[PDB]
């Protein structure tokens, strides 16, 4: 309950709700970002790419726009993403 | 590089400095010009220009 509320505060300090309620979150990015957060690891890199337009691409292809090692546990190539299973 | 050809291919939030640098180059690199010389009373010797 502590971590959940804190994570909400971060998500809302950026992206004010009234301007972003309609946007769709990328489940992959959301899962990775949340997992790092309660692992007491910084998550700033993920917040820039929390959303995606489902009518224009998949949650995968939305990520492959940035083909490089985002972080030590989240590595994405031009065609694929590697991460530990939750 | 295509990104150099079109700086819009570089995400600002992800690579700010590179995007700015490309736009700076594309905006401030000087424009070439031309001017005459010599005398019309003589041959030109120019090939392309």
UniProtKB/Swiss-Prot annotation, chain A:
It comes from the Viruses. It is found in: Virion. Belongs to the aquareoviridae outer capsid VP1 protein family. Outer capsid protein involved in mRNA capping. Catalyzes the last 3 enzymatic activities for formation of the 5' cap structure on the viral plus-strand transcripts, namely the RNA guanylyltransferase, RNA-7N- and RNA-2'O-methyltransferase activities. This is Outer capsid protein VP1. It comes from Aquareovirus C (isolate Golden shiner/USA/GSRV/1977) (AQRV-C). The gene is S1. The chain holds residues 89 to 174 of 1299 of the full protein.
UniProtKB/Swiss-Prot annotation, chain B:
It is found in: Virion. Coiled coil: none annotated. It comes from the Viruses. Belongs to the turreted BTV-fold inner capsid family. Inner capsid protein that self-assembles to form an icosahedral capsid with a T=2 symmetry, which consists of 120 copies of VP2, with channels at each of its five-fold vertices. This capsid constitutes the innermost concentric layer of the viral mature particle. Homodecamer; each decamer is made up of two conformers of VP2, called VP2A and VP2B. 12 homodecamers assemble to form an icosahedral capsid. Interacts with VP6. This is Inner capsid protein VP3. It comes from Aquareovirus C (isolate Golden shiner/USA/GSRV/1977). The lineage of its organism: Viruses, Riboviria, Orthornavirae, Duplornaviricota, Resentoviricetes. The gene is S3.
